[PDB]
Design a protein around this nucleic acid. Structure first.
Lengths: 85, 52
DNA sequence: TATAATGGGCTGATGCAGG
């Protein structure tokens, strides 16, 4: 019943979503270099706020303990960048 | 179509209007499923900008 | 790692929504 709640995509919605996913990963790679940070850690910090703070935990492989303290600090550097960045 | 400046010369029983006219010419472009339009409705574009 | 594939096969004791 719960998977019948999501309508299935049309060919354009499918390619739209697929489109944005890949472009989003290219986004995060370049944000590693601007920032001097680590793509995986940026990946999880981007990840955190889309899902909500419902899910926040330590992710295996990341160097920092991922708690609201560090995701706030890392998010506000992310937002401290020029508008083109 | 509209007329900005109007200069007129007279000769015999006629007048000749050198019309500084201003208008927009439409061209239609067809989008297909694997392309995305990256321009919003009513955007301004110079020669060479990307639409889809 | 790439055609496309998108919704399963008999009793008694006690705590309850309903005349």
């Amino acid at each position: 019943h719960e998977i019948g709640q999501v309508p299935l995509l049309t060919l354009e919605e499918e390619v739209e979503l697929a489109r944005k996913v890949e472009e989003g990963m290219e986004a995060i790679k370049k944000l590693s270099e601007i920032t001097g940070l680590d793509p995986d850690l940026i990946r999880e910090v981007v990840r955190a706020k889309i899902l909500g703070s419902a899910r926040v935990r330590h992710i295996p492989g990341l160097k920092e303990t991922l708690d609201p303290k560090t995701v706030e600090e890392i998010d506000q550097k992310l937002k401290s960048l020029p508008k083109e960045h | 179509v509209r007329a900005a400046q109007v200069e007129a010369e007279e000769e015999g029983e006629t007048v000749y209007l050198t019309l500084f006219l201003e208008w927009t010419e439409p061209k239609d472009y067809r989008v297909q499923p694997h392309m995305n339009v990256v321009v919003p409705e009513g955007a301004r574009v110079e020669a060479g900008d990307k639409i889809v």
